[PDB]
Nucleic acid binder design. Structure first.
Length: 52
DNA sequence: TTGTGTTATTGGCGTTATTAAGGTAACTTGCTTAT
């Protein structure tokens, strides 16, 4: 369903969207917070139990 | 004023440098481009 939103009128596949999503937020060379987003989120939530 | 000397051009010629056309047979198979 997400893959429809991102690419409308694009017939989905089996082993394609599995790359799309996990590359949308979960690729170290595609998305980052660079020591600041991490700290400003941790302190905002307290959860040191996530690696800063 | 009429003779003998240029000339300026102007279609023909060739010459060739430049442009266009075509052909290889080891196997090769679906981005998305990012306030």
């Amino acid at each position: 369903e997400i893959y429809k939103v991102l690419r409308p009128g694009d017939p989905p596949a089996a082993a394609s969207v599995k790359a799309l999503f996990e590359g949308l937020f979960f690729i170290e060379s595609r998305y980052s917070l660079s020591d600041i987003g991490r700290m400003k989120l941790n302190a905002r939530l307290g959860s040191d139990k996530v690696s800063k």
